Structure formats: C-alpha cells, structure tokens
C-alpha cells in the first residue's frame, strides 16, 4: 500500500538546488507544548525577498512515547503564495529520508525504529502531505540513535522578484528506556539459548529485536503461565498481541477485580478507572507493529487490580476459542501484608495506597499525608469508619515522611500509635515467619534468602489469594501460631461486623512487639517533630541508612488513630531490604569494617578510590561498636574533620567546593549523633573528566587523607574476570564467593563481572560443591546450566549440564545431594537441595579439563541483576582398578575381572585394598553391604565389627557406586555378602534409594533376619544421597493451579473469571501434610539449622514393587551376590 512503496533511490542533498550551506541554516526547533514537537511551515515557505533561506526544523527526542507533528501548507492555501510547492518524500508519514554516504535516501521509519505508532487517520483526514499534515508517535524505548529527514521545498515558488524558501525537518533521536513492562505474544515456540553469545553469527534481523523489548515473552505453544503485567506510577506498559487476534478487551472493555465493593458492573475503561491515564493505539492501526502502550500518571497513588482477555482467529475446531487471560497490575508495593492474609481484618473497608513522590520534586522522596483522610465523616454514611493504609518498599538513601494532623480544633484527642513513638521512637515490629513458610511451599523459597524477600512474584496475592487463605486455615503448622486467633474462621453464631473487626485490629496493634527504629537499624537518621511551625500538624521524617546491616528485612508500621474522635485510622506499611554488601570506602581506624571494601593499615596514611555512577563511597575515622564490645554512653572524640562537613563541601585542593558543583545533584548521607562516617551516592552526571575530591581527618595527632577519583569513561569496561582457587573443607571442594550467583545492585562497573573457580583433583573423596539451584519463579527465573570441554578435545559446541551428560564425559560418576539425617527411622530426611555435589570414581582415565557454568545473570531487574559463576575443574590421572565384579557387560571397563553373567562372585581381600560394588542395570539393591551387610544370612552393621570410622564405607553407602577400604587391624576372619535382587518379570528404574518398606519385604522373602542391629552415634556430620538431578516429585502447586484454570477458560465471553478463580482450589491430598511427621528430638542443630525436610522414597514405584514382591515366588527371583573374605 501507500505505507511502503520504497523502490526509488532519489539521490538528493539537504539544500537541494539552493546554494545555501549549513553555516547559514536557520536552525530552530519544533515548539514544545504538552509533549508535542510541532514545527508548522505556515507562512515560512512563502515567496519573499532575501532568499531562498533554508529553514530547518530540528526535533530532538529524548523522552518515551513522544508525539511528533509536522504541517506544510497546500497548493492554493493563499493566493499565489504557495504554487508549485513540492513535498519530499511523497510518502512521508512512514517513508523517511535517511543519510548514507553524502546523500539523502528514502527508508522505512518502521525498520529504523521498531514500534512506530503510525496513525492512518489524523483529524478524520488522511495522514500525508497530500493533506498537508503528517502525524506519528514514537515508541517508549529506543535501542540506538536514529536520524531521518523530511523535505518541504518551495524553491520553485516565485512572484516577480520574490522566491520561496526551502523547509527541512531533522528529527534526532537518542537512546532512552530499557524495556516495556508487559507481554510479547510471539509466533514461535519456546526455546532456550546457550550460555554463550558466539552463535550470533547470523545477521541483525528483525526477529531478535522483538524478543529483547518486553520483560515477559509468551510463546505460541507449550505455554504454562499466563501473563502478569505490573505497572507503577510514572511507568509504562504495553502488550504485543498475536497476529491472529480476533478481539481484545484489554483496553476500554476491561474488568476490575475487587469483589468487596464492586456492583457487578460488566466492563469499565482504563481512562475512567485511572484518572489522567492515556491509552495509545486504541484502534490497533499500524503497518506491522500491533502494539498498544499505556502511561500511568505520577500523581496516581491508588492500588487496583484488573483482568482482560485476548481472542484469536480460527479458534480450535469450530467455535472453541483458546483465549488468553493476562493480568494487569498498576500499583502494588509491599503487598504481602497481614491485612490480606488474615480473614478477621477482611470485613473492615480500607483504602490501600502507595507512597507518592513528594511535591519537592526529589526523585527519592516519598510522602503520605492523612490530613484529609482522618476527618470525622458525615453520620449519614452507613458504611462506617474507614482504614487508610500506605504501603512502600524502601531502599538505600530513600527518604520517607509521614504527615499527620493533630489540631484540636478539627481532630481532638487523636492518638498516635505506637504510644511510645513520640518518646522512645518505637515502631510495631512484625514477624515474617508465615511469609517464609508460604513462600517455601509455592515459590521454593529458602530462609537463607530472606534478605531478597518481596522480589518473588506477586501471584500469592492476586489472582490466587484464596489459596493463601485456605493454606493458613487447613495446614496444622499455623494452628499454634501466636496470631492464630486472628486468621481463624468466623461462625454464624459468632460473626464479625465492621465494629468487631475494628476492635480486633486495635487489639492486634496493641499486642505486636515494639522495637525502637534507631536501635534496630543503625546509621538511620530519624527526626520527629511533635508540632510543626503551623501549630496543626505532627510529622515523622527519616532517611534509610546507606547500608542495611540486618540479617532479615525489617517490617513494621506506625501512624495515627482517631477512633476516640469517631474518625478514621491511618497506617503506613514499610519494608527495608539490603541492596549491596560492600561499600568502597577507606577506614583509617584500627577497628575493621566488614562492609568497607578497603581497610587501611595504620602504617599507611593515604587512601585512593575510583568512583562511578550509582556507587557509594564511605569515609570513617572513628570507632565502631562491634557485638563483642559493650555499648556505653561515651562522648564522641574530638575528631578534627576538615571541612567540618566532609562530603557536602569537599576539598578540591586547598579551597572548599560544594559537591553539587562537581556532581549533578549528589545525594549525601551523614549521622546526626556521630561525626563520622559520611557517605555519598554518585548521581548520574555529565562531568566525564577525571576529577579529584578529598577529605581529611586527624586521628591521634596524625592526619589521614582520602582521595576519590570520579571518572565516567566514554566506553565502560568490557569485562572484569576474577579467578579464585577452590579450598578443601572437610574433604569437600569449596569455592569462596560462590553466592555471587545471587542478584546484585546494578552498579555501572558491576554489570559484567564474571567469577571463575579453579578446581584441581588429585586425590579420592572428590566432592565438588556447586551452588546452582533449579530455575524457579522470582530470583532464579533464568538459571541455565551449561558445560564445555577443553581437554583432550576442545568441543566447540556448548551443551547443557545434567547427570547423563556428566556420565558420558566421565564414566561411572555421579551427582549427589547433601543429606544430614539423624535417625533412619524417620520418613523424611534433611536435605540441602540448593547445592549438588559431583562425585568422580578413582579411575580418572586421563587429564579432563572442563567448565561448568550457570548464567543467572540472564535474570535482570530494574535495580538488581543476577550473577554468573564458572567452575573450572581439572582432574589428575589415576590407574587404580577397584576390586569388584562386572555382573553386566556395561560394567566391564571398571573392573579387572570379566564377571559377566557370574551371579556368585567371591573376592579374597587383604588390608590396604579398595573394593567397589555395582548392581546390574535396573536391579534392586538389597542391602548397603557397607553400613548394613549380610553376615551368615543375618543383616549386620559391619561398621562396628570392623571399627570403621569416617572411611569410604560410611561415606559411600548410599550411592549407586559403593566403595570400601579394608581396615588395618581386624579381630578375626570375617565374611560378608552383598546381594542385588533382580525380578525376572520386569525391569525396574530405581531412581531413589529403596525405602525400609520395600527392603523389609525383600528380607522376609529372601530369608534375612535383623534383631541385633545397632545404629550409629555420629554427630555433626554429612552424607551424600542420590536423587535424580532435579526432584520431579516436588509438585509445582502454581503450575497445577494455572493448568486447571486454563482448562476452565476463565474469560471467553462474559465468563466472570473472578468466580472461576475462586472455585479453583488445589486438593490437599496431593501433599503428605506436615513433613516433620512423628516425634522429632530436634537436638541436631548445626550451621544452617532446620533446612527443607523432603521425602526421598518414591512411594508410587515402591508400592508397585511391594505388590510385585508379595505376588512373586522364589523361582522368579534371581540373586547377584558379591562375597568378600577379610583375613
């Protein structure tokens, strides 16, 4: 169509036929009025004397979702002042003039800039210069700078001695934005790229551009998850609809969620739902980009959840449509609160709001004012009192202010809670135990990742809130919680009304533990003003410290209560989490600081640092109170600090200069009660030069000086590789900084930091610790495990890392998980599932050099980005053939005896020997034979008989390949047997160690008795047990819930998805109840402590095996026995 008819080179210059050069160009930009670049050519191209003077319109775009409008008068607009006007290019709302070589050539603006919002209709007229007005809208994110031109030439217009000018439009676009918070419905199936980007040899096509623009991508087939779009005040979202779309109600004909106040209204519009919101591309008109964009105004502060649906062409067969439900979120900060997970507080009608940006226009200032929300409402309001809550998640250097009216003329006798907040600066601390247990069951969360809480997906609140409510009600783990009376069920005989809910809420506030804010978090600046200068308002203001030295996030409230005056109640919800662990500062004092990167010895008197954007610089010259030191009230030492303030005004030599003159609006943090340390967060600045600033302190009549190098290179450092050597910790290969895989602050120089660990193996007991958890929602979404081979063959293709791949690289090797079991009688075992350990056999054939890589750096967020760790492993040659029997031909290479089909195997062993055991493929392991060994048809523990302690037998009794070392001294000749049971009917895949239920049944059939067995007494120890590579028995409750929800088609046509979601419930029979079954002594506490307790026995296959054993007889049972003689 007229949109794209590019077939003419049309070589032309900017000045065209005019001799005017670029030195005398009349360069003036398009007018700016309410986000609209307009440079109308009215009256500026008419014939006139002193010409033709070239007129150039320069449109510089550096903001998202920008609208650009250009107007050129038509022929005959005014009598004989516009004849012979020409428009170049002829198609110029879409085709644009670009600059290659030294010429101007036509190109498609859609190709240059993706997501262009072409409007075919402008003011009910056609969008072209044939009308004289052209209109288009730019996308919100641009990857690279783009320049294109438009031409409106009037050189051929003349009137006797008058001649027309030449009009040029120059639109200059700079990169801006990162990504769109929304969905991208693609026309391709789900695929995972390799850890390396070297396979990008293909050209820079258009398909790659599409996938790198939205935070979430949804594929055409094998989808498991519906979209979840979350927005924020001042943020932008968007949706890329499928090419086969039939209808869409995601704009205008949309649907709110909140059933508590809804009047069963069918549809509502986003413009009506959110004031001052504007929707782009409502009609879905564009050449190729079927997209729509939304902008939420900054002043918006309300929280609100919404649904919508997308319908496709061609349905499934005739009328069955596989429509999609995608969720829209506009404002939900710190939503995991106890005002949603507790049913007793449901009846009270509340208004949930977020802390808006302060009027002072500071980017990191947040304010809630309850002056107009605590008013004594009209008595005619039958709804009653209202609850107003602010929720907000604070970070480093953030400033939060609570604004509250206490005027006796309007709000008499208002009460500020806590009552000790005014005097003791105390706030209501809350426990987060319930959130931890809930997150563990659904999101596979571990308590060691508490510091990264609130980053996990918000699915637990919406749309699946009823699941969380049922979890507390049903599971007995929450029955004995101290707040069980609050989240218990109501009754018809004991109902809860609006007044009753208010009374319990007042009781809830009065019973929560109170902790002083300053004492809880140090280096926190808190200021409380009982009465302001206006004699009306009570204000509480504080700023978050530059570093949060708290093990777990701090979760609290405070505010104002006007119940006595029949008014409303104000509550502010705040959370604080750690951002980064290290601060690049210089500590000149003897007492070292764990969070200071550079601690300077007393012999050194100067310290130099390099600074960059978003980085925190510290400077300490006074004492610090460690927990080993008794805190006392001692006046600060007379520290001679020059300047009196160190970092707001800094020394640039001998003269003092304020920091804002060097850095563009710098943020500095000090301590009111401590002279030092002082901190600065580097803001985005344009001062690319290497500027020097400094402070100084006098410690014990000795002057200490700190030097800071502020730099911002034209090109950031490409890579920063740090190599570390593995360390041996109790026969286990461990590497420091292995937790670097966790997300870190998106500092400029920390964006591309890669950590490599070097591992060398030359002895047995080779356990390789790898912290590389399975991919899960939230913090580990995009974890991929890949490996490559260096020696003896340099494999050019990257391959995924798994148990099968590792077996091919090194035969007869296993990956094992740490188990900390205390008593074998328990039905569940203590397992650390985050770490998986690689075990290699003694027979290392030759030098194998390979790397194991996890690339969680693919997980990226607005403020934090994931890690990347490389495990470089080298193994030394060995030639030890462990003694054993090769029952199957597959085990021939491991043992020196060709015992193929030799059911009875006897080995005569002597001290200083090593014996390994293997069962034939897919056969049931009768006994461990190293911890429980059959002696004279009796199951006996040879560990006590042979006085074995921390040898191979004890550490390898639960592996697929079990090894044992003969002790130096033995009391007498001893004979023990190791047996594998094979059932002739079927071949069994034993993926987990056999449980005692199956083993006892085999003992009865195989005539084995155990009545004198004695268990071990080892404490504070560890064992390896095999369980696949990633447990498939830990059913994903969320995946099952969405799969069942998808079957019901929650939104096809007026389907009311709210009722369908509520009816969606997971069956509790899928879970075995509380894992800590039976009686737990709980005395085995060490290091991490109470880890995840999961069942290891695969019940379904064991039940089949148990039934098979009972039905079978002796004739159908075959035995493979290893006999070991020790003399």
């Amino acid at each position, epitope marked *: 169509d007229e949109l794209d008819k590019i077939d003419l080179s049309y070589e032309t*210059t900017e*000045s065209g036929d005019t*001799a005017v*050069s670029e*030195d005398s160009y009349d360069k003036y930009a398009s007018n700016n009025t309410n986000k609209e670049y307009v440079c109308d050519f009215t009256d500026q191209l008419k014939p006139t004397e002193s010409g033709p003077k070239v007129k150039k319109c320069e449109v510089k775009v550096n903001e998202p979702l920008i609208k650009v409008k250009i107007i050129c008068p038509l022929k005959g607009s005014v009598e004989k002042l516009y004849d012979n006007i020409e428009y170049v290019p002829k198609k110029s709302p879409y085709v644009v003039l670009t600059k290659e070589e030294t*010429k101007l050539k036509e190109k498609l603006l859609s190709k240059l800039i993706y997501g262009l919002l072409i409007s075919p209709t402008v003011n009910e007229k056609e969008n072209n210069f044939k009308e004289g007005v052209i209109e288009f809208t730019l996308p919100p994110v641009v990857h690279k700078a783009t*320049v294109f031109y438009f031409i409106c030439d009037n050189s051929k217009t003349e009137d006797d001695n008058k001649k027309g000018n030449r009009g040029i439009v120059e639109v200059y676009v700079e990169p801006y934005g990162n990504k769109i918070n929304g969905c991208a419905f693609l026309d391709e199936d789900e695929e995972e790229e390799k850890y390396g980007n070297q396979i990008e040899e293909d050209e820079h096509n258009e398909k790659i551009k599409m996938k790198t623009f939205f935070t979430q991508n949804i594929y055409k087939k094998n989808n498991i998850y519906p979209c979840y779009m979350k927005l924020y005040s001042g943020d932008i979202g968007g949706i890329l609809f499928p090419k086969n779309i039939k209808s869409t109600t995601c704009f205008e004909e949309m649907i709110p969620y909140n059933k508590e106040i809804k009047w069963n209204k069918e549809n509502k519009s986003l413009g009506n739902l959110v004031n001052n919101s504007v929707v782009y591309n409502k009609e879905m008109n564009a050449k190729y980009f079927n997209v729509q964009y939304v902008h939420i105004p900054t002043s918006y502060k309300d929280t609100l959840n919404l649904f919508c649906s997308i319908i496709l062409k061609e349905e499934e067969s005739n009328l069955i449509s596989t429509s999609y439900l995608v969720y829209v979120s506009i404002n939900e900060e710190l939503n995991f609160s106890l005002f949603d997970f507790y049913e007793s507080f449901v009846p009270i009608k509340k208004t949930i709001q977020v802390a808006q940006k302060n009027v002072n226009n500071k980017e990191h200032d947040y304010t809630c004012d309850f002056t107009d929300k605590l008013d004594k409402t009209v008595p005619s309001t039958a709804n009653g009192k209202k609850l107003f809550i602010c929720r907000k998640h604070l970070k480093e250097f953030d400033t939060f202010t609570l604004k509250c009216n206490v005027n006796k003329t309007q709000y008499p006798n208002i009460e500020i809670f806590p009552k000790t907040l005014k005097d003791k600066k105390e706030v209501l601390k809350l426990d987060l135990d319930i959130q931890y247990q809930m997150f563990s069951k659904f999101f596979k969360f571990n308590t060691q990742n508490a510091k990264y809480l609130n980053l996990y997906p918000y699915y637990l609140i919406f749309p699946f809130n009823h699941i969380g409510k049922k979890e507390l009600k049903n599971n007995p783990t929450y029955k004995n919680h101290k707040d069980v009376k609050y989240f218990e069920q109501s009754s018809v005989l004991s109902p809860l009304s609006s007044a009753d809910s208010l009374g319990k809420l007042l009781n809830f506030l009065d019973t929560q533990e109170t902790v002083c804010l300053t004492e809880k978090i140090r280096y926190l600046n808190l200021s409380i003003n009982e009465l302001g200068s206006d004699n009306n308002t009570f204000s509480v203001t504080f700023q978050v410290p530059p570093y949060i030295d708290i093990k777990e996030p701090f979760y609290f409230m405070f505010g104002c209560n006007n119940n006595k005056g029949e008014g409303n109640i104000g509550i502010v919800e705040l959370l604080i989490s750690k951002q980064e662990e290290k601060i690049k500062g210089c500590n000149f004092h003897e007492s070292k600081l764990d969070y200071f990167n550079e601690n300077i010895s007393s012999d050194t008197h100067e310290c130099t640092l390099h600074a960059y954007e978003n980085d925190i610089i510290g400077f300490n010259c006074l004492e610090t109170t460690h927990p080993n030191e008794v805190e006392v009230e001692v006046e600060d030492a007379e520290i001679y600090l020059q300047p009196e303030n160190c970092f707001n005004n800094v020394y640039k030599g001998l003269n003092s200069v304020d920091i804002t003159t060097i850095l563009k609006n710098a943020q500095t943090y000090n301590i009111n009660n401590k002279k030092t340390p002082t901190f600065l967060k580097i803001p985005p600045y344009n001062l690319l030069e290497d500027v020097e600033i400094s402070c100084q302190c006098t410690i014990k009549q000795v002057v200490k000086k700190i030097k800071v190098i502020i730099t911002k290179n*034209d090109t950031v450092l490409l890579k920063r590789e740090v190599q570390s050597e593995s360390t041996l910790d109790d026969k286990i290969y461990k590497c420091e900084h292995e937790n670097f895989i966790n997300p870190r602050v998106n500092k400029t120089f920390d964006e591309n930091v890669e950590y490599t660990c070097n591992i060398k193996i030359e002895n047995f007991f080779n356990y390789i610790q790898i912290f590389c958890p399975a991919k899960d929602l939230g913090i580990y979404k995009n974890i991929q495990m890949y490996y490559d081979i260096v020696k003896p063959t340099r494999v050019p293709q990257f391959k995924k890392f798994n148990n099968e791949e590792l077996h091919k690289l090194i035969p007869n090797s296993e990956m094992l998980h740490k188990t900390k079991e205390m008593l074998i009688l328990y039905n569940e075992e203590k397992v650390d599932l985050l770490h998986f350990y690689v075990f290699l056999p003694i027979y290392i054939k030759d030098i194998y050099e390979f790397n194991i890589v996890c690339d969680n750096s693919k997980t990226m967020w607005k403020n934090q980005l994931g890690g990347k760790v490389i495990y470089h492993i080298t193994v030394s040659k060995r030639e030890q053939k462990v003694k054993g029997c090769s029952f199957d031909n597959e085990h021939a290479h491991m043992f020196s005896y060709n015992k193929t089909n030799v059911k009875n195997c006897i080995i005569d062993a002597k001290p200083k020997d090593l014996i390994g055991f293997v069962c034939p493929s897919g056969t049931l392991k009768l006994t461990n034979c190293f911890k429980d060994a059959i002696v004279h048809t009796n199951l006996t523990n040879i560990n006590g008989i042979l006085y074995l302690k921390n040898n191979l037998a004890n550490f390898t009794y639960k592996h697929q390949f079990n090894y044992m070392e003969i002790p130096a001294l033995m009391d007498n000749d001893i004979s023990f047997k190791c047996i594998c049971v094979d059932l002739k009917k079927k071949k069994y895949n034993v993926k987990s160690p056999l449980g005692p239920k199956v083993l006892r049944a085999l003992y009865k059939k195989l005539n084995i008795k155990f009545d004198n067995y004695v268990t071990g007494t080892d404490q504070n120890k560890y064992l390896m047990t095999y369980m696949d590579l990633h447990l498939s028995h830990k059913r994903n409750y969320l995946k099952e819930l969405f799969h069942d929800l998808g079957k019901k088609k929650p939104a096809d046509t007026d389907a009311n998805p709210e009722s369908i979601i509520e009816s969606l419930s997971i069956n509790e029979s899928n879970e075995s109840g509380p894992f800590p079954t039976g009686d737990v002594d709980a005395e085995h506490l060490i290091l991490e402590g109470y880890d995840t307790w999961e069942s290891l026995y695969d019940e379904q296959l064991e039940e089949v095996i148990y039934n098979d054993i009972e039905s079978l007889e002796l004739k159908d049972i075959e035995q493979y026995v290893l006999q070991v003689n020790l003399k």
Partner: antibody
Amino acid sequence: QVQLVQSGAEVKKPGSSVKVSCKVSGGTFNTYAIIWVRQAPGQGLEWMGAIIPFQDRGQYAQKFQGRVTITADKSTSTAYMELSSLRSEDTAVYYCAKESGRAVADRWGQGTLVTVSS
Amino acid sequence: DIVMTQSPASLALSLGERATLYCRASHSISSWLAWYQQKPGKAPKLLIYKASTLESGVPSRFSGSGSGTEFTLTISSLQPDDFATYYCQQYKSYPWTFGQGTKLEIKR
C-alpha cells in the same frame, strides 16, 4: 564561520603507529560526515575513509583495511585518526574534510605531513 | 572504484588566454563532480561544488559543464591568481577518487 584544524607534522619509525587529530569548529558536528584524503607528493590524491559522528561505525576504502582507523568524539567535536603498521611509501600529506550538506566536501583542513623513512 | 581520467597533464599559458580543463569518468555518471584548486603549499580548495554551480567567493570566470562520461571545465581568462594545480573528484559512490592533476604554467 566553520574552520578545520589539524595537528602538526610527525615522523614515526616503520612498524609504529601515527595519530592525526582533527577538529571541526562552527556549524554542527553530529549530522555531517567527515572525510579523509591523503596524497603522495607528485601524484594524485587518495581517498581513505569517512565517518558520521552520531554513529561510531565508520567505513574505509576497499583497499585499506585494519591499518586505517577513523573515530569521532562528539564531546570534544573531534575526528581523530589512528594509522597503524606504517610502511614505506606512506610518506605523504594527509588531508581532512567534511561535507556541508551539498553532498560534496566543501571545507578542508590545513593538512598534515607524515614521514616513514627508517 | 570510479576512475578520474583527468587530462591533460600540464598547460602553459600567459595572462588573458583561455584554459579548458577536462575530467572523464570510467562510466556514465549523472553529475556529482567537483573541481579542487591547489597551489604548491595550499590546502585543496573547493571552487565548483556541482555540475556547474560555484561556491561563494569563487570568481565568475570559472564555468563548469558536461555530464555523463565526459565533463569539461572552461576558464574564460586567466588572472595572476589563477595558476595552480587542479584536481577533479567524483562522489556518486562512497569510494571517492582524485585525478592525476593538471598544471598551469605561466608564460611561454
């Protein structure tokens, strides 16, 4: 108003690298290309490459690869050139120019002289 | 690349005489040719920036013409400041080129 300024003449040993500094004063810098030409004395001029400052991706002559390098820095409005692995016959006068919107190089610099004899 | 077969090699003339320069091309090209003036020790100065147009400040005795495979630059009369070495450059394609150059000798 527009004027072009180039560095002084320099002598370098064979196998070394020589850098030529170019600055564009007046007009505007981003949206016009800057071209480079060299000429051995007594013979015709030779074209080498050009760059448009807003995009760091420059292009060079088909005969000259690798050794010639042209870069632009909009912060200082400069168009430095780096030439590496010098060899005999490189002793020539080097010239810089930019196009004024009329599709042709309209302004030329003062020039630079390079010597490569051992 | 586009070849600049500029002819002749040198021209010996006196004051007031007529000079006619030529610059042919390897293949037919529509315009986009410029002529550069350069005395010994001067920077190449642009005098004609298109097929026939002239730069501001260039004297009126200069006159360009020709298109396609052949181009002609004619100087009606030489003045004391008109003797230099002249070059012709094509820019229809990105790989620009320059000719061997023409010499303007004073007197005979």
